[PDB]
């Protein structure tokens, strides 16, 4: 009986980078992988190992990109593609940013997207003094079908009212919203 003893694969491998501002290296070399799974279970360990978002000091990132795309725009998966941005009070802090980031997480895991989750590149968290940012990537920016998709479906498994609005924007500007839900 495989269900008894086989974990659980999900339909990718997923890496987990941690980033931490020091300004004595370039913004590439602040960029760590920290490890990678493919089934459920490993996706557990990991998150209940490491430390809440909100618990990061400031100036520190999360992400999680599929296996073989670097969470940067220069990566061939990234460069023409963008993010789907949630911007964050500093009383969010407290309130939404480790909900939210885990719904991303697991939004990304689940391949919650239907037939567009294939145009997801990963997701970022950043923790910062001004207000922290969670951000889904998307592989091609013009892909207007895909794109408006994943932020419909994004916004409501977030839980926002209509009285939010959330953009996307393309790396190649961020190096303006092209999609609004
Ligand atoms: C070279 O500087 C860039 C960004 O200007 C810098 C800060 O990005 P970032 O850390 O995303 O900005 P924040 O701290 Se949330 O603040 P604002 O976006 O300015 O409100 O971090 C570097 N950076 C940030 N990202 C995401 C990249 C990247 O993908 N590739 C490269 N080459 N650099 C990146």
Request: hydrophobic residues 35%; charged residues 30%; contains cysteine.
């Amino acid at each position: 009986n495989p269900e008894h003893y086989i974990k659980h694969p999900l339909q990718n491998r997923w890496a987990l980078w941690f980033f931490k501002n020091d300004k004595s290296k370039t913004w590439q070399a602040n960029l760590r992988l920290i490890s990678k799974f493919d089934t459920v279970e490993d996706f557990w360990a990991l998150y209940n190992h490491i430390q809440l978002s909100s618990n990061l000091m400031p100036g520190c990132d999360y992400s999680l990109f599929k296996d073989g795309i670097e969470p940067m725009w220069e990566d061939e998966k990234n460069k023409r593609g963008g993010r789907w941005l949630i911007t964050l009070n500093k009383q969010q802090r407290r309130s939404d940013l480790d909900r939210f980031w885990l719904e991303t997480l697991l939004c990304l895991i689940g391949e919650s997207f239907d037939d567009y989750s294939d145009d997801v590149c990963g997701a970022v968290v950043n923790v910062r003094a001004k207000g922290d940012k969670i951000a889904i990537w998307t592989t091609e920016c013009e892909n207007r079908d895909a794109v408006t998709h994943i932020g419909r479906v994004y916004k409501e498994r977030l839980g926002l009212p209509p009285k939010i609005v959330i953009g996307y924007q393309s790396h190649a500007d961020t190096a303006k919203n092209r999609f609004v839900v």
